[PDB]
Amino acid sequence: MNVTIYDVAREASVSMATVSRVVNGNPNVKPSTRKKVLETIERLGYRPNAVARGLASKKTTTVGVIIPDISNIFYAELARGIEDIASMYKYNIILSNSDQNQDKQLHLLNNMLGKQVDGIIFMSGNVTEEHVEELKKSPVPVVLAASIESTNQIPSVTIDYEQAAFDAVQSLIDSGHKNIAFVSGTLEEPINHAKKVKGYKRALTESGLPVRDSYIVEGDYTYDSGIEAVEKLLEEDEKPTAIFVGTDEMALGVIHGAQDRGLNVPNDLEIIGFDNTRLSTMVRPQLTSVVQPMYDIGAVAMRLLTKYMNKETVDSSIVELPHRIEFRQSTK
Amino acid sequence: MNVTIYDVAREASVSMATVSRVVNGNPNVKPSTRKKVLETIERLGYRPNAVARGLASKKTTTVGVIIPDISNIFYAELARGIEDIASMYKYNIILSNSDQNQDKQLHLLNNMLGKQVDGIIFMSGNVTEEHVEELKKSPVPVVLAASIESTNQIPSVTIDYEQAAFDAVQSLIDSGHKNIAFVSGTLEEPINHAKKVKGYKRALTESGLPVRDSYIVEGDYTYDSGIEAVEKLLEEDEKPTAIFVGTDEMALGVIHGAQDRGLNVPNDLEIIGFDNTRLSTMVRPQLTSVVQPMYDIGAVAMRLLTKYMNKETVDSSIVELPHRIEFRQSTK
Amino acid sequence: MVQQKVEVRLKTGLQARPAALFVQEANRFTSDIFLEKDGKKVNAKSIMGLMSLAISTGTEITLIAQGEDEQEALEKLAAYVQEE
Amino acid sequence: MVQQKVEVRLKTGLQARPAALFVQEANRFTSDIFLEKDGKKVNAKSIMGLMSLAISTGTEITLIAQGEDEQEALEKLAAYVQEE
DNA sequence: CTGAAAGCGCTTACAG
DNA sequence: CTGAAAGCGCTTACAG
């Protein structure tokens, strides 16, 4: 603030352009004089001005993250991963919540973009055609996380939500279960009606089981939204022998819905969730869930992004980590 | 990047100093010419450079938050609150994790400080004498969150962890319970051995009950760390009739520890947790917990901080929101 | 100056983000707005204040509005806190 | 070039932050380091690679180290993944 | 209302 | 290795 690169040029009897060379660290100075410069720095408390460096270097060492809601354990981990890999590449971060709505996103976007970010990790449950054609001309590199967008005109690390759903809904089938419903989140989120539902129905039809509109009910994403659906199933003639859920909490609120109706899990019904949240092992019975490595999805998207700003070699802009299933006390 | 305030000075036939007046919005320009300026801006796509404005205004419109670990639901909410109140005052944010260790904190600190933040919300489980005397001379305003630091030389919004513990440990007492243990987190965190434990023991001694070192056991902060402690209590002669826990998860892992040992909650033991996490209502039985308004603690600390940068009137630098208790299926 | 005593059918009450939304909602009105709670009243367009009361479910509170849009304001605020 | 086949007594395995720590741990060695998994091997100082294998508990994997501190490296890495 | 000028702290090419 | 100079895009006081 008061001690500049100028005042080091003073106490160092060197040139302002010298002082810069030492801080940034570019080899090419007299070590004999170099240290002459590293002394004053420690001696004066000279903290370089990241801003002054920004205007002149045309780079900031900062990525901006647009994330739905940092208060949900789900996006939480995702955030850490991004934060970590970034803190590892000496890249600082700018975070904010998009509340999932559009006119707030494009805003955060265009904003950060003016803050001069050197990059952007962006994740939303809805990547409207608009945003794509918007991100596409961003002056700085972009990379999506946990997000789905059909064209693939933008680099993105994501997992195969369809297989995920499929490979789980099948688990049920191989266990004889021929009447398994699916408790889903907002059906409008393409990462549901275009990935999970199809992955769900792909498993039924593929093995020759029905596909009626009485096994796939909607509802919000929290605990409660799961207590409802359950009720709707027992109180119906297509007795659901088991259920697939696109969120752990939801499931957790379905396990309960049923025990309150006196039924026993799994003797009366096996239930498999989605995400494998630390919350998963928290329930009783223990919830078997579809693993979605969020910490990894975030770490990769950032790491990938750094491998763009620094202009390294990308071999694929469609990265997909794998998945599994953690069988527990909710299934045979 | 290519369209500057200069190029608007061009297409607007106005002065560079004119163009600035309009963007920042300071009344004092010819509305007739003002609009002449707002047109080119929309017409050219002129996105101002937040950096150039930063070097010249000596203000950035950004606070930096130092937070322990953004992956724990606890700090999660805390983050949202800070993020919200900030996004409300048009103030951008910079987040990072201190992993709770010191040489990483002072680093994040001194770093952000060089990034030129206009302020800092800082929360850690340990505010060593060092950091204080360090924060104290920060060139920009600081404010602590959920954090404890005895001297009070730094503005901070916090709740009364002692009362909290007291007013909860008493609940037990009025329910006859005279043998209640306390499952605590890292005892070394002043926000435990200097706030909760005393608040715990203040309740015993005050009502004339004992205070033996066989009711207050340590253990990590997660689910598992709670399964242990429980075991240590049943398998002991000072039969714990109930237990107080400094974290919900921990408790949640104690409720279980006991049912697995066949005992019944609460007939065999009432248990009250701490934080009142959304995870609280997730358990079965439902966990009665000490309410600690994190979303509020964060929103206040930021809001307070804004009411410092803008140099408004502060009436207290020791803000404390209140607390309560959410009785549920874990107590009579 | 328009006044009204209201319940708060909110589940979280006036805390957490709901609270925070209440305040932003309040600012969509030019009318100085206020919220009284069992005696202490604070500015309802201020996060500091509103959050210091920690108004939980079941509590009844008087809300005050004085300005061009006091009816409009009040209409909305009470409405919001009504959960309904 | 020093080699070793190891289990991975880790509870989360080589995923989540543990994974991420493994990589930072790997970089404290000048020795080019690698990790083989059932056939595919990636750079162990690279987050991209290590995370694409998604190595969970119970899996045995060969780790390779070639450099001034290959023993030192290996000693530590295998050690880490050993949970023990 | 409103130009012209100087200055924010660093860097980046350009001559030694 | 290494100075001197110009320039990053905006703002801030200073004269109209």
Side-chain angles (χ1 to χ4, degrees), chain A residues 2-25 27 29-332, chain B residues 2-25 27 29-332, chain C, chain D:
Chain A
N2 266 190
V3 297
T4 165
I5 180 174
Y6 181 28
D7 296 314
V8 162
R10 263 285 79 81
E11 239 65 4
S13 187
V14 301
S15 164
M16 182 176 268
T18 331
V19 179
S20 179
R21 300 182 198 280
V22 313
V23 179
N24 184 193
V29 194
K30 177 157 189 172
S32 169
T33 57
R34 167 194 316 296
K35 303 300 172 174
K36 164 74 162 68
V37 168
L38 307 180
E39 135 66 353
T40 68
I41 290 177
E42 188 205 17
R43 192 188 196 296
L44 289 62
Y46 172 84
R47 194 196 303 140
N49 186 297
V51 186
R53 179 182 71 217
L55 211 215
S57 79
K58 227 115 191 71
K59 298 295 178 68
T60 44
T61 290
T62 320
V63 281
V65 315
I66 296 171
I67 186 186
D69 163 66
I70 183 77
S71 79
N72 150 26
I73 181 270
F74 193 33
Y75 295 110
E77 287 288 305
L78 191 350
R80 196 62 161 75
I82 309 194
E83 214 286 344
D84 284 356
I85 288 29
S87 162
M88 168 186 302
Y89 285 83
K90 292 135 62 77
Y91 266 111
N92 245 129
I93 188 184
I94 265 171
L95 176 164
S96 62
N97 314 100
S98 74
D99 292 321
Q100 205 68 305
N101 87 76
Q102 297 176 52
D103 77 275
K104 211 294 177 175
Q105 311 191 301
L106 217 179
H107 179 69
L108 284 165
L109 163 53
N110 271 290
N111 157 35
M112 250 153 240
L113 222 316
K115 181 84 80 181
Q116 298 313 279
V117 285
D118 294 334
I120 305 185
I121 304 299
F122 171 84
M123 60 191 81
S124 87
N126 215 306
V127 182
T128 69
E129 284 175 43
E130 191 182 1
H131 299 314
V132 164
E133 65 173 52
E134 190 94 55
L135 279 41
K136 290 184 55 178
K137 302 233 64 185
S138 152
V140 302
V142 168
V143 27
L144 306 188
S147 316
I148 290 299
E149 97 72 348
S150 53
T151 78
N152 294 79
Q153 296 166 48
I154 21 53
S156 62
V157 44
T158 120
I159 78 169
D160 187 64
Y161 305 89
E162 178 189 292
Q163 269 309 71
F166 180 107
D167 304 320
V169 175
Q170 263 277 192
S171 165
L172 319 173
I173 288 187
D174 333 313
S175 288
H177 291 274
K178 310 163 197 66
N179 285 304
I180 50 281
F182 174 17
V183 178
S184 46
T186 311
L187 285 173
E188 187 179 6
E189 278 171 22
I191 316 154
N192 281 64
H193 76 81
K195 261 57 169 69
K196 301 218 192 80
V197 162
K198 287 199 298 182
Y200 160 101
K201 293 204 302 180
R202 220 196 83 208
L204 290 179
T205 62
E206 187 163 295
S207 225
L209 292 173
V211 289
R212 45 279 284 297
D213 289 285
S214 302
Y215 291 61
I216 176 175
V217 60
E218 193 165 9
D220 65 70
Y221 277 117
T222 58
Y223 188 135
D224 298 289
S225 39
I227 284 296
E228 284 75 54
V230 200
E231 283 176 351
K232 183 169 300 170
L233 296 179
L234 322 170
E235 315 163 320
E236 179 162 299
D237 13 298
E238 290 58 281
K239 305 77 174 293
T241 65
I243 311 174
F244 174 60
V245 273
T247 271
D248 278 320
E249 202 179 317
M250 283 211 268
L252 198 162
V254 172
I255 296 296
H256 270 304
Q259 309 184 302
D260 286 330
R261 276 299 258 229
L263 304 92
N264 164 291
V265 183
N267 300 309
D268 304 5
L269 80 184
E270 289 180 56
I271 291 173
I272 180 170
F274 209 105
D275 291 344
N276 180 75
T277 56
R278 310 157 59 267
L279 219 168
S280 193
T281 69
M282 241 81 101
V283 220
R284 196 72 187 185
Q286 290 221 313
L287 173 52
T288 70
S289 183
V290 185
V291 194
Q292 179 164 180
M294 281 286 119
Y295 185 110
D296 284 16
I297 301 286
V300 166
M302 180 54 191
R303 164 56 195 163
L304 199 195
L305 164 63
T306 71
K307 180 194 302 191
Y308 250 118
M309 309 184 251
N310 288 298
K311 285 181 301 180
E312 283 186 48
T313 69
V314 171
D315 327 69
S316 166
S317 297
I318 318 163
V319 175
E320 276 176 46
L321 284 71
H323 53 310
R324 300 131 36 188
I325 305 180
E326 264 307 1
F327 290 78
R328 313 168 186 280
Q329 190 187 319
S330 193
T331 61
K332 345 286 186 49
Chain B
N2 266 190
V3 297
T4 165
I5 180 174
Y6 181 28
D7 296 314
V8 162
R10 263 285 79 81
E11 239 65 4
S13 187
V14 301
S15 164
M16 182 176 268
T18 331
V19 179
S20 179
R21 300 182 198 280
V22 313
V23 179
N24 184 193
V29 194
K30 177 157 189 172
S32 169
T33 57
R34 167 194 316 296
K35 303 300 172 174
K36 164 74 162 68
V37 168
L38 307 180
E39 135 66 353
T40 68
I41 290 177
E42 188 205 17
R43 192 188 196 296
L44 289 62
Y46 172 84
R47 194 196 303 140
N49 186 297
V51 186
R53 179 182 71 217
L55 211 215
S57 79
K58 227 115 191 71
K59 298 295 178 68
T60 44
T61 290
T62 320
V63 281
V65 315
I66 296 171
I67 186 186
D69 163 66
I70 183 77
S71 79
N72 150 26
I73 181 270
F74 193 33
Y75 295 110
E77 287 288 305
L78 191 350
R80 196 62 161 75
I82 309 194
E83 214 286 344
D84 284 356
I85 288 29
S87 162
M88 168 186 302
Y89 285 83
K90 292 135 62 77
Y91 266 111
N92 245 129
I93 188 184
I94 265 171
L95 176 164
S96 62
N97 314 100
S98 74
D99 292 321
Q100 205 68 305
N101 87 76
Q102 297 176 52
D103 77 275
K104 211 294 177 175
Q105 311 191 301
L106 217 179
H107 179 69
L108 284 165
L109 163 53
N110 271 290
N111 157 35
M112 250 153 240
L113 222 316
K115 181 84 80 181
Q116 298 313 279
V117 285
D118 294 334
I120 305 185
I121 304 299
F122 171 84
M123 60 191 81
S124 87
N126 215 306
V127 182
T128 69
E129 284 175 43
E130 191 182 1
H131 299 314
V132 164
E133 65 173 52
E134 190 94 55
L135 279 41
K136 290 184 55 178
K137 302 233 64 185
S138 152
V140 302
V142 168
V143 27
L144 306 188
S147 316
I148 290 299
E149 97 72 348
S150 53
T151 78
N152 294 79
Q153 296 166 48
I154 21 53
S156 62
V157 44
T158 120
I159 78 169
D160 187 64
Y161 305 89
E162 178 189 292
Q163 269 309 71
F166 180 107
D167 304 320
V169 175
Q170 263 277 192
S171 165
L172 319 173
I173 288 187
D174 333 313
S175 288
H177 291 274
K178 310 163 197 66
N179 285 304
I180 50 281
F182 174 17
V183 178
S184 46
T186 311
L187 285 173
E188 187 179 6
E189 278 171 22
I191 316 154
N192 281 64
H193 76 81
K195 261 57 169 69
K196 301 218 192 80
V197 162
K198 287 199 298 182
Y200 160 101
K201 293 204 302 180
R202 220 196 83 208
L204 290 179
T205 62
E206 187 163 295
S207 225
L209 292 173
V211 289
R212 45 279 284 297
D213 289 285
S214 302
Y215 291 61
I216 176 175
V217 60
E218 193 165 9
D220 65 70
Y221 277 117
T222 58
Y223 188 135
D224 298 289
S225 39
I227 284 296
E228 284 75 54
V230 200
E231 283 176 351
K232 183 169 300 170
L233 296 179
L234 322 170
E235 315 163 320
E236 179 162 299
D237 13 298
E238 290 58 281
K239 305 77 174 293
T241 65
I243 311 174
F244 174 60
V245 273
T247 271
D248 278 320
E249 202 179 317
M250 283 211 268
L252 198 162
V254 172
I255 296 296
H256 270 304
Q259 309 184 302
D260 286 330
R261 276 299 258 229
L263 304 92
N264 164 291
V265 183
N267 300 309
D268 304 5
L269 80 184
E270 289 180 56
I271 291 173
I272 180 170
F274 209 105
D275 291 344
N276 180 75
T277 56
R278 310 157 59 267
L279 219 168
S280 193
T281 69
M282 241 81 101
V283 220
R284 196 72 187 185
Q286 290 221 313
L287 173 52
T288 70
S289 183
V290 185
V291 194
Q292 179 164 180
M294 281 286 119
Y295 185 110
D296 284 16
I297 301 286
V300 166
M302 180 54 191
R303 164 56 195 163
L304 199 195
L305 164 63
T306 71
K307 180 194 302 191
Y308 250 118
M309 309 184 251
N310 288 298
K311 285 181 301 180
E312 283 186 48
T313 69
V314 171
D315 327 69
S316 166
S317 297
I318 318 163
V319 175
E320 276 176 46
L321 284 71
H323 53 310
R324 300 131 36 188
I325 305 180
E326 264 307 1
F327 290 78
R328 313 168 186 280
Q329 190 187 319
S330 193
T331 61
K332 345 286 186 49
Chain C
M1 97 107 280
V2 175
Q3 182 164 157
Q4 165 154 32
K5 302 164 99 294
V6 208
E7 182 90 356
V8 53
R9 289 152 150 38
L10 288 180
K11 315 251 65 177
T12 308
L14 271 163
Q15 292 203 269
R17 198 176 173 197
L21 277 192
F22 182 49
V23 179
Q24 266 291 71
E25 184 66 292
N27 293 237
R28 289 200 181 66
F29 302 117
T30 349
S31 316
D32 294 45
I33 294 185
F34 281 93
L35 174 141
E36 282 202 320
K37 181 283 262 282
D38 311 54
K40 279 184 68 176
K41 75 154 187 181
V42 305
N43 199 319
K45 286 170 175 164
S46 163
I47 303 78
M48 290 271 269
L50 187 223
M51 246 142 249
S52 273
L53 289 315
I55 320 71
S56 30
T57 304
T59 306
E60 166 205 78
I61 49 77
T62 317
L63 73 98
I64 301 73
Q66 48 189 41
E68 170 210 317
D69 44 306
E70 45 182 46
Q71 225 96 64
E72 298 92 326
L74 220 79
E75 211 170 61
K76 264 293 304 168
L77 295 218
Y80 176 104
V81 172
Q82 277 287 299
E83 166 187 50
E84 281 187 286
Chain D
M1 97 107 280
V2 175
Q3 182 164 157
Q4 165 154 32
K5 302 164 99 294
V6 208
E7 182 90 356
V8 53
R9 289 152 150 38
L10 288 180
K11 315 251 65 177
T12 308
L14 271 163
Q15 292 203 269
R17 198 176 173 197
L21 277 192
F22 182 49
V23 179
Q24 266 291 71
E25 184 66 292
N27 293 237
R28 289 200 181 66
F29 302 117
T30 349
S31 316
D32 294 45
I33 294 185
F34 281 93
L35 174 141
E36 282 202 320
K37 181 283 262 282
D38 311 54
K40 279 184 68 176
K41 75 154 187 181
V42 305
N43 199 319
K45 286 170 175 164
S46 163
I47 303 78
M48 290 271 269
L50 187 223
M51 246 142 249
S52 273
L53 289 315
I55 320 71
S56 30
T57 304
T59 306
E60 166 205 78
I61 49 77
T62 317
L63 73 98
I64 301 73
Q66 48 189 41
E68 170 210 317
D69 44 306
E70 45 182 46
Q71 225 96 64
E72 298 92 326
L74 220 79
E75 211 170 61
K76 264 293 304 168
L77 295 218
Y80 176 104
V81 172
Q82 277 287 299
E83 166 187 50
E84 281 187 286

